[PDB]
């Protein structure tokens, strides 16, 4: 039981494999909604600082067109919970969190193991 | 304890020895040092009393984990984690730093051994006595 | 009953010595201290009685995980879980902390060891007696 | 305070003997040296006082890894990480270095052994005494 | 923590399994840009020396035309940062870095494990 | 040390015994050798004093790893790495060079044993004395 | 200096005993032999002096890998690689050769054993001394 113990251990573990020099940011957009005529723009960014761990790099090939893209998997803490379509900014390079994957056996997940795919293509 | 200057000096010397203690709230440091002053004899040292008291307080708090308790913890004082791992992300393994076959209990931390050798320098660890009158 | 404000001082002293006990309901601490006062002498210390009783109560509580939660602790005190793991989520193992050698029960927990040293400092570890007339 | 230029020479010689300490801030080393000076005598060496004091301070700093980082250190001196691994990136293990066999605490690090030999050659390891009349 | 420890270990490991007798080089091309009519050439080569190790050779078969080419993997150091579209000169043979694969958990990745595919076909 | 030709001869002897020290900057070797000459006695050898200085310097610097620290290294003197491996690229496992159950600590490196044998041949390991007058 | 033809005979017979030593430059061997000549005596053999000096120099060189490569050796004499393996090409493990049980440093290499056997056969392994008036 005692999920606070799992929480503290996960926090220390994530802090172990992290570098406090990589600029990482998290972008949450929301609350859109169209005009009576049918076109508008959502004016909100909601960017916040964050830090964590990354592993398993992979490259992307689409049809041989030389686009040179890459994707990552991550490990994070339980502050500023991750949603299913948020943006993660890494070193000036933006990725979409395609999957959250919270390491879970209870509510208020102890940590997240997201899968990131590079923006555009 | 006899004043506050000695207490502050002891806490500051302890923090100089262990820079990690600078972020710990000083209240627990006061508590630990005023509990450790019960064991030290200033008649014996009378010049390095602050150094000895800080050394003994550090060893006393680092015996087996007694300062390990911050504002948030549970009753893990009877048991020690040996390993912890996420299933597919990372793994980590712990262990005890020093074996203590001697059983004197005072050579359980480096600060304890330092305090014993400092005690032998100041006034020997012998205890020789005779019945008087 | 042992003196009320002295008991309050003892319980708050052990609480600020181990901050993790702040969340524990108070009356359990009252019961533990009122039970532990049966062991320590009075005139032997007569100055640091509060510190000594706090130390011995803490040692008694953390002897072998005798002090548990309120209801969340399952009715299993003769059984200890060494390890557990969920399928693809996490894993963990455990182990003993002290590995005692003499079976005195006193050099088995850090609190007990500190109380033992305090007793040796204050009164002694000797019992010399002879038949009276 | 012991002579300022002698202390500077001590820290300089220690630094040039162990290059890795050049990055450590000077004041922590100052504190370590002025704390370690309490052990050695002067008339014992009176020529290699700087050498002996630097050796002993180095041994104290490297006793059980007591000298740690400033803030990067986490408040666990009672626990050592035997091994750690990331999932698909790397892995690593550790272990003890010396495996002391005599419990002298001077024969536990190479620096302690070096200082022990220096003391033995200069004055000796003996203490013969008798009562005054 | 202490990623310099991992840096030193990786450098020593790469130096272990390497031969300082294989002519190896790195080629970087960049700074193009077209004419007002639509055709030009970027006049630069940017070749630099480099050393490393390789493993897992694999031949190339297309449809049975007997072209007889091969492909390999690499292990490299943390200097002369490897990009996604660079050329690697191996013993008279050029390959293109199809995949970088930095072994990374922090910034300035400790080492690279690139995938090299032979030039032309 | 008393002059410069003996110092240069010692440095040359060390470098032509172990050639990996040719890359090491000279001043560190100078510090090590002038520190190590504090043990060797000229009157015993009087002919192979340079050889003895070189042997002692090599053994003392290779005792357990103290010259390991070059211009950049971290606080790894208290722990030994036993294995290191990338997840799918290569692996490497290390181990101790010599076992030393004797504990004399002169029998820890081959240079130490060579120096001890040289001492035995030139003037025996004995130390026999009597109280004068 | 020993006679030049004696040194040449020693080094050449050493090379024919161990042909793999042909590739090393001829100056390191001169240095090793000139250091090893400080151990072998004269009247003990007076016949097979070249054989004895070659055997002793070989034992000194191959004691604990004292003789390393020219530059291919890394500055790590206190660490041995027990195994190494590349990911998908090959693997290899390492191991010790003698497992000495006497702590003599002469029953550690085959050359040392041969040298002691020859010494015992020719002169002996004893020393009876009596006081001179």
Shape of chain A: globular
Oligomer state equals part of a larger assembly
How many strand segments of chain A?
Answer: 9
Whole-Å distance between the termini of chain B? 34 Å
The biggest chain-chain interface is: B-C, 33 and 41 residues
Secondary-structure content class of chain B: alpha+beta
Helix content of chain B: 40-55%
Beta-strand level of the residues of chain A, as a percent range? 25-35%
Classify the secondary structure makeup of chain A into a structural class. Answer: mainly beta
| Beta strand count of chain B | 2
Biggest sheet record of chain A: 7 strands, antiparallel
- The radius of gyration computed from the alpha-carbon positions of chain A, rounded to a whole number of angstroms, is 17 Å
Radius of gyration of chain B: 18 Å
Organism (chains B, C, D, F, G): Escherichia phage FCWL1
Protein name (chains B, C, D, F, G): Adaptor protein
Protein name (chains A, E): Connector protein
Task: Please describe what this structure looks like.
The structure is cut from a larger assembly and holds two copies of chain A (121 residues) and five copies of chain B (133 residues). Helices cover 12% and strands 35% of the residues of chain A. Chain A has one helix and nine strands; from the N terminus they run αβββββββββ. Chain A has a seven-stranded antiparallel beta sheet, with no helix packed on it. A two-stranded antiparallel sheet of chain A has the order 7-8. The termini of chain A are far apart. Chain B is α+β, with helices and mostly antiparallel strands and 133 residues long. Helices cover 41% and strands 11% of the residues of chain B. Chain B is built from five helices and two strands, in the order ααααββα. Chain B has a two-stranded antiparallel sheet with strand order 1-2. The radius of gyration of chain B is 18 Å and the shape is globular. Chain B starts with a helix and ends in an 11-residue tail after the last helix. Chains in contact: A-B, A-C, A-D, A-E, B-C, B-D, D-E, D-F, E-F, E-G, F-G. Chain B binds chain C through residues 27-28, 31-32, 35, 38-39, 60, 63-66, 69-75, 77-88, 103, 105, and chain C through 16-20, 22, 48, 51, 62-65, 67-69, 80, 85-98, 101-102, 107, 109-111, 113-114, 117-118, 121. Strand 2 of chain F pairs antiparallel with strand 1 (80-86) of chain G, so a sheet runs across the interface. It is classed as viral protein. Keywords: icosahedrally averaged, viral protein. The Composite Cryo-EM Structure of the Portal Vertex of Bacteriophage FCWL1. Chains A, E: Connector protein.
């Amino acid at each position: 039981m005692n999920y606070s113990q799992i929480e503290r251990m996960a926090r220390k573990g994530v802090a172990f494999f992290t570098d406090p020099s990589r600029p990482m940011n998290l972008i949450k957009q929301g609350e859109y909604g169209y005009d009576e005529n049918g076109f508008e723009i959502p004016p909100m960014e909601q960017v916040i600082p964050i830090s964590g761990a990354t592993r398993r790099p992979n490259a992307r090939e689409i049809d041989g067109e030389t686009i040179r893209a890459s994707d990552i998997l991550g490990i994070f803490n339980n502050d500023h919970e991750i949603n299913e379509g948020d943006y993660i900014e890494i070193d000036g390079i933006r990725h979409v969190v395609v999957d959250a994957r919270p390491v879970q056996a209870s509510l208020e997940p102890v940590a997240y193991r997201p899968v990131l795919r590079r923006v555009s293509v | 304890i006899m004043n506050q200057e000695t207490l502050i000096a002891a806490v500051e010397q302890m923090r100089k020895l262990v820079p990690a203690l600078r972020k710990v709230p000083d209240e627990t440091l006061y508590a630990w040092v005023e509990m450790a002053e019960l064991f030290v004899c200033q008649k014996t040292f009378k010049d390095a009393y602050v150094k000895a008291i800080a050394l003994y307080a550090l060893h006393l708090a680092f015996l087996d984990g007694a300062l390990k308790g911050e504002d948030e913890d549970l009753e893990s004082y009877s048991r020690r984690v040996t390993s912890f791992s996420l299933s597919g992300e990372f793994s980590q393994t712990f262990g005890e730093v020093t074996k203590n076959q001697s059983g004197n209990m005072m050579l359980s931390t480096p600060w304890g051994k330092m305090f014993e050798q400092l005690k032998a320098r100041r006034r020997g660890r012998f205890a020789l006595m005779t019945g008087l009158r």
